[PDB]
Amino acid sequence: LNNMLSQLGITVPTGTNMQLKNVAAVMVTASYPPFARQGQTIDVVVSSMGNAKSLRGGTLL
């Protein structure tokens, strides 16, 4: 999250308190199809990877 914020233009000081609740770290997996052309779309699977309770209404960045 700090990497993303820094990339966007906001530098959070280091060694500071930060406890979020609406964010989860996920692994995304997909299947590259045959003869795939750039611009097309595929379906992805999103899976939690640490101590999260649910991904009910989330959005993948």
Partner: protein, 211 residues
Amino acid sequence: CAWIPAKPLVQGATTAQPIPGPVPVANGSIFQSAQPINYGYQPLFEDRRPRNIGDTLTIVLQENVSASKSSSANASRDGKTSFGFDTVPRYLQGLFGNSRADMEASGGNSFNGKGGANASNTFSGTLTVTVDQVLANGNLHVVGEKQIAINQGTEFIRFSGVVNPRTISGSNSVPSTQVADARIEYVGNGYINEAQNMGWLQRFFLNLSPM
């Protein structure tokens, strides 16, 4: 001397006169805006980082380097041999008589070498520099100079380097250990500085003396 005219460090006029604003145009409005110099798009939530030529940026000089080395070696050797026939029996007098076989010898050797070296330096302060070029990958070349004159002489603190924008903190400041081609300089003039150069004769001897 103190009567020889010298120019001050801060030259020119040290005051400015306010200029009267323009006469308001007689539309139906009370709000009158003097000609506003339009500056470009400015983000709202992003930190105030320098982005173009001429922007300022604070450097926090904190340098602390310290290196050292040493070594040694040694060696030693002793030896001491002896032999003495005090009372020789008669039947042996033809071989060990008249002290013809007594012997005594000694020997020694020693060596000790050693050496070492070290170096160190520190630096602490704060200095605001200015961007003078934007590189092809977003890095900023920065240069800066601060001149002080406390009652007798003049000290100069100059700085130059290259900064990566993603290292600038939220308060528009970078520690000097994150600058790539750091050139720092802290010099002075006046007789206080002249009292710290070696005399030409001593400087010559320091280089050409045999020892």
